Design a protein around this ligand. Structure first.
Ligand SMILES: [Mg+2]
Ligand SMILES: [Mg+2]
Lengths: 46, 43, 143, 297, 126, 145, 143, 50, 126
């Protein structure tokens, strides 16, 4: 899910939401995707 | 209701096929595709 | 820029796979269209191409006969080796300008391979009969 | 670089069956040239032409034919541009789809709009060939439907095409593709010359030849069907799909002309490039909104 | 022309059966039939007959019940039997199973017609 | 020209022929690229080899849809004694894969499902049973070996 | 960038091992499919390939016969040496264009090795009989 | 068996096995108006891109 | 056809045993049997027999108890004995142990049938 751009709030805190809005939910910025795409591209070109 | 497809070729008549197409008109959920509204927004 | 090209090579790889499959789907569609009484195919195909359909195996996928649409480094390398080999044959008087032109306008590795093998056989046979003719001429002169 | 060629995967691999089919083809060509050649005037010309086909092989002839077809149609249709458009579709949606069909007797290839294809009954498969049922709904011009269905449209249907009010003046063309089921028979017969068991597949109407050791079984097997509806009153080409994409050993392997892929990760929905650049674009738009309001003040 | 043909998607696909219609009876046609081809050169045929693999199925001849029960024919004539055996292949002329089934059915009906013709010839000469 | 060949040569040619054809046919490198992505996400890369429709086929297994039991701290998946594969297949796929063994009752079951996606739950069990076999000691008749 | 490639070469090494094992598993699956009455294998295989199954050793792993799927520097170096050796044979009139084309389209190191050894034998034998023929011609002229 | 396409005015040759069907088929037409009173070249387009 | 065959996963795998069924008795079949092959050219066989490695196991012949005890047969006839000996190999035609066991069992049953046939021939000529 993290690679597919989905963040679970229950995976980084206790949830004391289910509404898809930032004033209580958190943005995900997929900064990990490029790193893995580099390695898969090199795998393809080997 | 989509008609029955366990028939012999003889019983697959004209009205059977017309029923198939009418069902197709009566009508989207997929497991590995986004909604049409999502794709429309992207385009 | 290469290291950045790695980031998008996955998009390009899945695209290339989709293209290969779409060309196979087009090839089977064209095969089925062959047996539909269309005179266009008589113009873009050879005689043997238009007689292949008369055999009883033409209803099935070409991948089941060992024929696959392929755009990989193997195919490009094979094309380069065949072209360079034909050039090396052109010098040494082993391959004709006509058959060179046929190789340049073949589109099939099998066709140009067969053309090269052909010309090897005819030049070898003409050389051998030339030696035989000269030898028998000398022998009958001595006789 | 775009050079997609049909190649023989194992070109040094020739078998007896390939040789038999080659011999059949050469015999057929011999008969044709005897039929056409008028008493030795050009018979030797035909022999000179077909002598160099003796060193060919069955796989070579098939590969030449396939390359000829693909070469001509790639150059004719500008297929690479179609693929470029589909690649753009894939980067926007993560979905790239193409349809192969016969229209006017020639094979044609078209890029499917991802918003105008409804794919049903797939198994978390990223390939579009694996669907059991696909519906294509699009608006065609009257000229296109008459170009595509002249030989099956009834006079009543063409009057329907005339009598529409035409307040664009296009027609809703809904095309259904669905894998039906057919009953086929797996008959086991012995080769008469040698005591070798043989297998064959026949339709349900086949009568098993008793008194010869033929025993039969009944299987239910996929068949690809199609049907088209134009407007709301026209019903055209309701039949088994005449292009059954068949395989040698499996009678149930068939699909439709539609081929494509989902650019997804592990049986999920595709997280496209536009998806992963969109939040940044929205933040850019908001911040530039603040910038413009600052510029105004 | 719809007789043994599937003219769809701008092509002309056939299952091999030749529905030789619109000509007329041998006596009613001034040319004694349609004269499909030259090979006996006068290969004449009437409206009711069908041809598969250069073999003519006769419409005037009837099906004996003895030959009905064995080989499992359906039509009242041999031409009608051939027309009923090839119904499955008309809508799918490209399908390998349909082609094999059609070939088997046509061989069966051909053998049945040869048996009937031998029986009639023997009875007439008797 | 096959006289100068050897048994190992003929076997190697056959194996290379099979792998060459099927690598070019299936685009196996793309399957391996997907599995490599799976490995970098999970640390788990799995592939299944099976016969379907008489031909050999190779598929990438979803790491979330394979239950591997009875292994011995082994990082290899071949070492498991029992594996369960649970996935949702289309009716077309199950009929493509089991036409020659599905009974008419089973195909009626496939029809009669309500179909409110219309996929079928296909659970495949693989397990190492045990068989009793005999180790028989015999003498070569010609030589006392 | 090489020193950074070292950081991920372990992922790549385990990936390559998994690929080798998956290709061996596919090879055994294909071997078992051979004896299943499928006519596809008659098209992608030679005659000898389709007769190997008739021997009673085909039920077991190929690794038990000395055959292993291998993508290592040894295999690539062997392929390069064989290709370069074939090129060096092409000049000096020791190897035919036809057999060169066969080497370019072989996929097996054993096959192309045997092809080179073949052509060495036939050119050597034809040369030797040529010398013998010339010598006996001179001898009978003198006689 | 042979196939051909003919216009509607063609008379099917009975007594030779010729059976016929009627299809409606696109034809490209053109027409020009100059000013408001002139009407020129109202006919099937002589360049039928067939 | 399920007779000595394992048709699964889209293939046709056999253990070598040929369950020659659906033909009929020699007298009931118009062609005197199924006529599997040509080699004596008329190699005729009936419905009850099975064949392994071109060796026919006869269903009409019975198993003497003397030949039952030694070689350890199970079926009442030789065909039934062969059908019972190959049950283990049907579901695993590829297994080397099953192939070896089937070969051994088929050789044993063949030798038993030859012994029975010699005994019957000697008794009849007696
Ligand atoms: Mg041309
Ligand atoms: Mg081959």
């Amino acid at each position: 899910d993290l690679l597919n751009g989905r963040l679970h709030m229950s995976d980084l805190e206790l949830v004391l939401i289910k509404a898809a809005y930032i004033p209580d939910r958190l943005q995900h910025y997929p900064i990990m995707n490029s790193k893995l795409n580099v390695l898969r591209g090199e795998e393809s070109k080997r | 209701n989509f008609p029955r497809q366990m028939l012999p070729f003889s019983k697959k008549t004209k009205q059977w096929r017309k029923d198939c197409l009418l069902w197709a008109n009566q009508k989207n959920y997929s497991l590995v595709r986004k909604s049409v509204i999502h794709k429309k927004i992207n385009y | 820029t290469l290291q950045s090209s790695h980031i998008t090579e996955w998009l390009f790889t899945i695209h290339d796979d989709v293209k290969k499959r779409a060309l196979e789907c087009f090839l089977e569609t064209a095969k089925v269209a062959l047996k539909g009484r269309n005179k266009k195919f008589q113009y873009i195909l050879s005689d043997t191409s238009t007689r292949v359909m008369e055999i009883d195996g033409d209803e099935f996928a070409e991948a089941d006969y060992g024929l696959v649409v392929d755009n990989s480094n193997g195919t490009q390398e094979l094309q380069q080796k065949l072209d360079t080999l034909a050039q090396a044959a052109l010098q040494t008087q082993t391959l004709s300008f006509s058959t060179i032109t046929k190789l340049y306008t073949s589109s099939s590795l099998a066709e140009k391979q067969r053309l090269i093998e052909k010309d090897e056989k005819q030049i070898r046979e003409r050389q051998a009969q030339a030696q035989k003719e000269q030898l028998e001429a000398q022998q009958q002169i001595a006789a | 670089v775009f050079d997609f060629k049909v190649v023989v995967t194992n070109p040094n691999a020739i078998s007896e069956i390939e040789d038999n089919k080659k011999n059949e083809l050469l015999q057929r060509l011999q008969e044709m040239i005897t039929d056409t050649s008028i008493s030795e005037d050009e018979y030797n010309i035909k022999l000179e032409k077909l002598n160099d086909y003796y060193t060919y092989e069955w796989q070579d002839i098939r590969e030449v034919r396939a390359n000829e077809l693909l070469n001509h149609y790639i150059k004719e249709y500008d297929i690479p541009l179609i693929f470029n458009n589909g690649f753009m579709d894939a980067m926007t949606c993560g979905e790239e789809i193409y349809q192969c069909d016969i229209v006017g007797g020639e094979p044609v290839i078209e890029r499917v709009n991802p918003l105008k294809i409804r794919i049903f009954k797939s198994g978390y498969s990223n390939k579009v060939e694996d669907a059991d049922m696909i519906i294509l709904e699009d608006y065609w011009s009257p000229g296109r439907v008459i170009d595509t269905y002249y030989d099956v449209l009834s006079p009543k249907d063409i009057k329907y095409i005339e009598t529409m009010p035409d307040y664009a003046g296009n027609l809703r063309v809904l095309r259904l593709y669905w894998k039906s089921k057919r009953k086929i028979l797996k008959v086991k017969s012995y080769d008469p010359e040698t005591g070798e068991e043989e297998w064959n597949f026949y339709p349900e109407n086949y009568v098993v030849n008793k008194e010869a050791g033929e025993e039969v079984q009944s299987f239910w097997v996929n068949e690809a069907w199609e049907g088209t509806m134009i407007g709301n009153e026209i019903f055209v080409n309701m039949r088994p799909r005449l292009i059954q994409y068949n395989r040698l050993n499996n009678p149930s392997r068939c699909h439709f002309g539609i081929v494509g892929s989902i650019y997804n990760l592990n049986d999920s929905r595709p997280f496209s490039l536009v998806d992963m650049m969109k939040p940044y674009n929205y933040l850019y738009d908001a911040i530039h909104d603040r910038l413009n309001k600052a510029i105004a003040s | 022309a719809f007789g043994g043909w599937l003219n769809t998607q701008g092509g002309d696909f056939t299952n091999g059966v030749t529905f030789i219609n619109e000509g007329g009876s041998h006596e009613e046609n001034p040319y004694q039939g349609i004269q499909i081809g030259v090979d006996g050169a006068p290969n004449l045929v009437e409206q009711g007959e069908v041809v598969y693999d250069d073999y003519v199925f006769s419409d005037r001849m009837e099906i004996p019940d003895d030959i009905r029960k064995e080989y499992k024919l359906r039509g009242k004539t041999f031409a009608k039997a051939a027309k009923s055996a090839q119904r499955e292949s008309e809508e799918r002329p490209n399908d390998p199973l349909s082609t094999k089934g059609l070939q088997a059915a046509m061989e069966r009906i051909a053998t049945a017609q040869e048996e009937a013709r031998q029986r009639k010839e023997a009875h007439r000469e008797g």
